[PDB]
Amino acid sequence: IAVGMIETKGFPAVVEAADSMVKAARVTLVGYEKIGSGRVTVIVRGDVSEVQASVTAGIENIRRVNGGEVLSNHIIARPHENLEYVLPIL
Amino acid sequence: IAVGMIETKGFPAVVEAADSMVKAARVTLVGYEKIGSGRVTVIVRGDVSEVQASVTAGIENIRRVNGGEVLSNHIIARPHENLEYVLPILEH
Amino acid sequence: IAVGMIETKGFPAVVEAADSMVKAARVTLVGYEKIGSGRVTVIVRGDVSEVQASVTAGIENIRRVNGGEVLSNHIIARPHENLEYVLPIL
Amino acid sequence: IAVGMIETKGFPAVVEAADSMVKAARVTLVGYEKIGSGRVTVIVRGDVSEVQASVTAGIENIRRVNGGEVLSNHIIARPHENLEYVLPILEH
Amino acid sequence: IAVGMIETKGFPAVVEAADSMVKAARVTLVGYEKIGSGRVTVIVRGDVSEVQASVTAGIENIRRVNGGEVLSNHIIARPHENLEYVLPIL
Amino acid sequence: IAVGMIETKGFPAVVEAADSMVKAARVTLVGYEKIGSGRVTVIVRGDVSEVQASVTAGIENIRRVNGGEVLSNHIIARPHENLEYVLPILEH
């Protein structure tokens, strides 16, 4: 039920973030959010330990990306149920 | 009928803001608004006291966020009814 | 029939602009316009003297906003009827 | 069949532009176009002489606008028909 | 079957680009693409020699535009058929 | 099942990228993605060898483009299935 997010400047980087994330750990990819300014976020759910593993992987592997830039990242272990239908984290 | 808002630059931050807000106090998260340029606002309604507690929590918990940035925040204790049907400050 | 507009960088500020506007004077709020770049405008109609009162209030009260920034503001006392259905001022 | 355009950075300015244009001369306001980055263009059609009078008025009246800024302006006296169905320069 | 494109910062300039393009040569205007950041592209098709003529005209005439700014331009003489329905070049 | 992407600042560049990619090798152009700020990505799928040949060609041919700029590029040889239904990397 944890949520993990990686926000990049650039689309290719966000794809590699996503790929690496789902490969590293037992997490599933649920979201891809654009907010303009080149800022795109990919979002996964899973056990916190796994989501935690997945996010670490994504951040590491983005430096493999020519032009890759990570803007922010975050994990929430136990997100409130109210978030599930306001925010595209589902 | 109070309204609280936190505007961040970055999406993960806005999610923490939201999570923190609804956890800290008895308030309902009613929305999330993009206006471009990375700027996204998370919005809650509740008793002023609870909204004030939600906003304070969200602001202080965003500093935990790697790459998190808070651009603005605001509370209106008693917003005018006119605002509800022009501005996205009732449930989306 | 006057039109008053306040444009801010930031959404919360635009809400406070709106709130203050409708509270100060006999004006009604009709519009909220986004043009990107963080630029959002709120728009009211009413008697010029009131719209005038309302805009003054909104500009004053935005400094109460943590992160508040006013970009522009304007009043038109007697807007042409052609504007009403091209521009979201209605 | 002339076309006149004024592009501003800021929405209130574009409204003044439009107001000024249709007041100064015998022209019709046919649209308003956003392309991002605050950039919004107001567009009119009319006789070249009237369009030229509209645009001049709009530009000079925007300096009245607090925070107003004009980014570009242009007139085409006799625009090619091809433009009408690719570019938003007939009534929106 | 050639494709010619002119990208400006600003809308009025893109209109003058378009106008000049279709006037200079035997080319037809097919596209107007926005990608944000003020960046708008107009797109024509025609014989390469004509498209070539049309693009030269558009670039020259944009300096007539108060506030005119050309960001990029390009011609492809013989674009792959796969481009026609992925990209708004048709 | 490899994926190749080229992200440009500017639309004409992205068209050259695409043209170059599908011409250089046996790959299919599956999309074009805007994320704002001028940033547009062109995306192909194919055998890794062909995708690698497509991307190299596109990058080197964009330097021909007047005003062309490449912001990022990337290839994933064996992308995870999960990506296909969250990210726009199957045909648009």
From Swiss-Prot, chains B, D, F:
Recite the UniProt keywords alphabetically.
Bacterial microcompartment, Carbon dioxide fixation, Carboxysome, Photosynthesis
| Native source species | Synechocystis sp. (strain ATCC 27184 / PCC 6803 / Kazusa)
Q: Which domain of life is it from?
A: Bacteria
Q: Which family does it belong to?
A: Belongs to the bacterial microcompartments protein family. CcmK subfamily.
What does this chain do?
One of the shell proteins of the carboxysome, a polyhedral inclusion where RuBisCO (ribulose bisphosphate carboxylase, rbcL-rbcS) is sequestered. Assembles into hexamers which make sheets that form the facets of the polyhedral carboxysome. The hexamer central pore probably regulates metabolite flux. Probably the major shell protein of the carboxysome, a polyhedral inclusion where RuBisCO (ribulose bisphosphate carboxylase, rbcL-rbcS) is sequestered. The central pore probably regulates metabolite flux. Hexamers make sheets that form the facets of the carboxysome.
Q: What is its main location?
A: other
**Domain text from the record?**
The tight homohexamer forms a pore with an opening of about 5.0 Angstroms in diameter which is positively charged. Sulfate ions are bound in one crystal form in both the pore and between hexamers which may represent metabolite flux. The C-terminal flexible tail, which is the most variable part of CcmK proteins, seems to be involved in packing of hexamers in layers.
Gene symbol?
ccmK1
A GO BP entry is:
carbon fixation
GO MF term list: structural constituent of carboxysome shell
**Subunit arrangement?**
Homohexamer. Interacts with full-length CcmM. Forms mixed heterohexamers of all possible stoichiometries with CcmK2, which might form dodecamers. Only very weak interactions with CcmK3 and CcmK4 were seen. Interacts with CcmN and CcmO in the carboxysome.
Task: State if Amino-acid biosynthesis is listed as a keyword.
Answer: no
Q: Does the keyword Heme apply?
A: no
- Residue window of the full protein shown: 3 to 91 of 111
- Residues in BMC domain copies: 2-88
Gene Ontology terms, cellular component aspect? carboxysome
The name this protein goes by in its record:
Carboxysome shell protein CcmK1
